[PDB]
Design an enzyme around this catalytic site. Sequence first.
Site, PDB file in Angstrom:
ATOM      1  N   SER A 113     -15.648 -21.481  26.263  1.00  9.43           N
ATOM      2  CA  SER A 113     -14.507 -20.940  26.987  1.00  9.43           C
ATOM      3  C   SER A 113     -14.061 -19.602  26.383  1.00  9.43           C
ATOM      4  O   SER A 113     -13.622 -19.571  25.231  1.00  9.43           O
ATOM      5  CB  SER A 113     -13.343 -21.938  26.902  1.00  9.43           C
ATOM      6  OG  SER A 113     -12.147 -21.348  27.353  1.00  9.43           O
TER       7      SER A 113
HETATM    8  C1  LIG Z   1     -17.132 -23.064  35.780  1.00  8.05           C
HETATM    9  C2  LIG Z   1     -17.523 -23.106  34.310  1.00  8.05           C
HETATM   10  C3  LIG Z   1     -16.400 -23.629  33.407  1.00  8.05           C
HETATM   11  C4  LIG Z   1     -15.336 -22.566  33.123  1.00  8.05           C
HETATM   12  C5  LIG Z   1     -14.380 -22.993  32.017  1.00  8.05           C
HETATM   13  C6  LIG Z   1     -13.229 -22.002  31.962  1.00  8.05           C
HETATM   14  S1  LIG Z   1     -12.165 -22.070  30.498  1.00  8.05           S
HETATM   15  C7  LIG Z   1     -11.401 -23.667  30.884  1.00  8.05           C
HETATM   16  C8  LIG Z   1     -10.127 -23.471  31.699  1.00  8.05           C
HETATM   17  N1  LIG Z   1      -9.164 -22.675  30.938  1.00  8.05           N
HETATM   18  C9  LIG Z   1      -8.694 -21.529  31.437  1.00  8.05           C
HETATM   19  O1  LIG Z   1      -9.318 -20.916  32.527  1.00  8.05           O
HETATM   20  C10 LIG Z   1      -7.478 -20.919  30.785  1.00  8.05           C
HETATM   21  C11 LIG Z   1      -7.217 -19.511  31.332  1.00  8.05           C
HETATM   22  C12 LIG Z   1      -5.925 -18.937  30.774  1.00  8.05           C
HETATM   23  N2  LIG Z   1      -5.641 -17.712  31.533  1.00  8.05           N
HETATM   24  C13 LIG Z   1      -6.062 -18.613  29.315  1.00  8.05           C
HETATM   25  O2  LIG Z   1      -6.384 -17.448  28.970  1.00  8.05           O
HETATM   26  O3  LIG Z   1      -5.843 -19.475  28.418  1.00  8.05           O
HETATM   27  C14 LIG Z   1      -9.541 -24.813  31.980  1.00  8.05           C
HETATM   28  O4  LIG Z   1      -8.800 -25.375  30.962  1.00  8.05           O
HETATM   29  N3  LIG Z   1      -9.749 -25.390  33.163  1.00  8.05           N
HETATM   30  C15 LIG Z   1      -9.210 -26.718  33.471  1.00  8.05           C
HETATM   31  C16 LIG Z   1      -7.919 -26.651  34.255  1.00  8.05           C
HETATM   32  O5  LIG Z   1      -7.203 -25.624  34.202  1.00  8.05           O
HETATM   33  O6  LIG Z   1      -7.537 -27.626  34.954  1.00  8.05           O
END
Ligand SMILES: CCCCCCSC[C@H](NC(=O)CC[C@H]([NH3+])C(=O)O)C(=O)NCC(=O)O
Lengths: 218, 203
Positions: A9
């Site tokens: 991430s």
């Molecule tokens: C498609 C491939 C996988 C991508 C993973 C992306 S990182 C995981 C995601 N977290 C975020 O997008 C946080 C973004 C936030 N803007 C930050 O900077 O902390 C999450 O917790 N997501 C779960 C949720 O928000 O419910």
Amino acid sequence: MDFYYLPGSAPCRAVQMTAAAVGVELNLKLTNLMAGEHMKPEFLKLNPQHCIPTLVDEDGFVLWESRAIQIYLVEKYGAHDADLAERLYPSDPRRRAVVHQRLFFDVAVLYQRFAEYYYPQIAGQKVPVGDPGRLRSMEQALEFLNTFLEGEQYVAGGDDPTIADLSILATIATYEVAGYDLRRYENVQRWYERTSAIVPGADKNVEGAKVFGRYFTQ
Amino acid sequence: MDFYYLPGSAPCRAVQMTAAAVGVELNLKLTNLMAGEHMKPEFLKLNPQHCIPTLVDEDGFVLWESRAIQIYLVEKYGAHDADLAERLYPSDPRRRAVVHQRLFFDVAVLYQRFAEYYYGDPGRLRSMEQALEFLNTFLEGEQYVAGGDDPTIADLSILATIATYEVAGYDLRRYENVQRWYERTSAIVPGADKNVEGAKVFG
Ligand SMILES: CCCCCCSC[C@H](NC(=O)CC[C@H]([NH3+])C(=O)O)C(=O)NCC(=O)O
Ligand SMILES: CCCCCCSC[C@H](NC(=O)CC[C@H]([NH3+])C(=O)O)C(=O)NCC(=O)O
């Protein structure tokens, strides 16, 4: 301090670099999103937005959004070393404002457009092709970054990397492992190599970005 | 200080409420995006990202992203009234972190998902409603979005966003805490009447 995360991430990696810079050790707690570990009642009670990174500090104060965590780490856990905090997060309102704008740029433009272009391809429906409009939009974000970096060492200016560099470095490493040819953007590539070579916690960024490459094996 | 804006634009409305809160008068420079005024060389020289709101201060300092502008206005102009600055943008690292998280939530979740739905897809609707539920949850047992005893710049930002939801036709009374916060905060925040009016008349 508990740190709910996954190495792949980008936003988690931004926090890892920032914690390294201010000399904070994070207690790493892998949080498997596929498994719904972020949706467990105990997690939701900490963070009803069910997202990573989430930080839980020494008093049980819970914080999420990586860039809010970055600022908190500097202000609370870094500010004792005044010169360090000033390098990471300059206090002059003009300098501070450019750092903030670059942080918001990263969340809402640079990383946002990366997600809009790649996420449909690597998750959910796994669309076999990228939307060309989404590609152009993403390239426009890279072009903005390239422009910000024209005649500058770092994304928000300064003689040293700021938390804006750390956040955008997490993002740009993710562009690289997605297979985007960053050499198209000469200033971005120059900055990416240089910042990767000098920032604390770059090891976490490099290895975690490689993990995210697991979505791009085809 | 020059303020490049459109009256119906949420991020512009957020900056206008913040200027009002700190007693700053803005020199209004209507910048018509449909007319391509943001792509004129004069504007691009100020802001390569060609977006509004853009602020140009007395000293020639140029800034964009509404929420960065909000913070700048408090730090430079609000600071003349120490108690005011602390109400709008509390300095305690924990309190400030919640304000920051809410500002990022607004740009990347609440306004973002509004834009994705309105600029009707079942999935986009669901994603947007989830953002409203998040805000509804944040507001359980809290008068303001980032806590505190007074509105913060996070309230002002989210007020601009939520007024856009309202004019787009979303039934906000579905989220009781959201509606309660919206009506009450709109009643007490200086210029918040102009926020809704601007959203309604031009949005
Ligand atoms: C498609 C491939 C996988 C991508 C993973 C992306 S990182 C995981 C995601 N977290 C975020 O997008 C946080 C973004 C936030 N803007 C930050 O900077 O902390 C999450 O917790 N997501 C779960 C949720 O928000 O419910
Ligand atoms: C009737 C009013 C409704 C339309 C208003 C949309 S806001 C205009 C848009 N600006 C933004 O999206 C800025 C968003 C930024 N996150 C902020 O808060 O300042 C823009 O300049 N877009 C042009 C560009 O970026 O090129």
